[PDB]
Design a protein around this ligand. Structure first.
Ligand SMILES: O=c1cc(-c2ccccc2)oc2cc(O)c(O)c(O)c12
Ligand SMILES: O=c1cc(-c2ccccc2)oc2cc(O)c(O)c(O)c12
Ligand SMILES: [Cl-]
Ligand SMILES: [Cl-]
Lengths: 215, 215
């Protein structure tokens, strides 16, 4: 009834895995090969031709952020968004902030030396705004348990750690971002996340390859 | 109770005006000067420091797409999104598609000659996907009346027409995009939109100035 056309490394695919497992939705995970795309993936997502694509009752939903909101409306139990409209708007605001700024992380795969240190400092400033104005003193962006904002920022945990090691730069450190660093550790220790994250060595290998091709 | 920190030319500000007028929400329009920003605008939106910012009961909501969804949840009468989760996901998918591709319109203000003709053809292909897969044979993206998808695409009407005249290129024409061109004419004739759009001559003057500074 529910199929997820995904991958074993994509952070965008992992957002959907987390949301489905939080709702207790049974699904079949179809891991696609991006070099030779299947006919189902091209028929279901003819606009971007990429993963993740959730297929529910034969009907496709593409784009991780679109899929998350579809999951939240379709399986409303164990809510991942607050009920108050102002609180929901603040959640969507921070989700879109991360989605817009995820581009500034691209420079971490391209730049080198005194240019890569400039990109890493810009990434720290992006995360500091998120820490001060978004997280604040809460344990999670969803308060006392993870919500769609935490899920949307999950790529700043082990995927970002892998990018840092592959690029030779530090971005999310306890000295400079104390509350966001504690959040990232707390997020990764949540049993749902801990049992559903790619192996670090495989993720690091992926980032090294991505940095090699993007120079 | 409701204040809108806006401008007389921003298409992003006009999305909010349309949604508020469709809900029948009374509001005070505070037109800001972008060169010398007021202290209220800096306090309400310290992340982007831009308009539109809706302030409801003293609480600020920034980013036009975030404000639209806040308006839809806060004043649920005269719905601007469908009730079915799959239909709502398709609406959000097309809204995010336009938001992501709005960047390809930037080249219309920068490029010249054989480079500007390449940018205009890429814009036509972006609009063709939207026409075939998004609009189809419906009168409006919301079916028989405008919804948040029509509102989000309203910038492709007179703002785009002004960019075309300022740049000396044609993008949305009846021969090449028959259904999207008929939609744009129908949208602009909706009395709510017709009574709430900037004067074309002032909008054209704005685009000419923007193209001049961006060369
Ligand atoms: O666009 C991508 C961005 C990042 C990323 C991770 C952490 C922090 C910032 C960005 O990981 C990725 C991995 C993939 O397998 C893939 O196909 C991708 O497009 C991306
Ligand atoms: O980013 C902008 C994009 C466009 C635009 C309009 C039609 C089609 C595509 C893009 O208009 C604008 C007008 C403004 O006053 C402003 O501050 C802006 O940032 C924009
Ligand atoms: Cl995605
Ligand atoms: Cl906006």
């Amino acid at each position: 009834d529910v199929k997820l056309h995904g991958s074993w490394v994509s952070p965008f695919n992992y957002r959907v895995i987390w949301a489905l497992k939080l709702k207790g939705v049974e699904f079949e995970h179809i891991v696609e090969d991006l070099t030779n795309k299947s006919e189902l993936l091209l028929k279901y997502n003819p606009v971007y031709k990429k993963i993740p694509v959730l297929v529910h009752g034969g009907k496709p939903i593409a784009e991780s952020l679109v899929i998350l909101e579809y999951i939240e409306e379709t399986w409303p139990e164990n809510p991942l968004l607050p009920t108050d409209p102002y609180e929901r708007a603040m959640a969507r605001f921070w989700i879109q902030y991360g989605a817009t700024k995820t581009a500034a992380f691209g420079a971490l795969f391209r730049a080198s030396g005194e240019e890569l240190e400039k990109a890493a400092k810009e990434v720290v400033e992006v995360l500091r705004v998120l820490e001060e104005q978004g997280l604040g003193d809460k344990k999670f962006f969803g308060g006392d348990s993870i919500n769609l904002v935490d899920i949307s920022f999950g790529l700043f945990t082990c995927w970002l750690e892998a990018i840092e090691e592959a690029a030779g730069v530090k971005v999310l450190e306890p000295s400079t971002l104390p509350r966001l660093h504690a959040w990232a550790q707390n997020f990764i220790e949540v049993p749902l996340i801990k049992e559903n994250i790619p192996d670090y060595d495989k993720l690091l290998l992926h980032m090294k390859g991505v940095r090699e091709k993007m120079m």
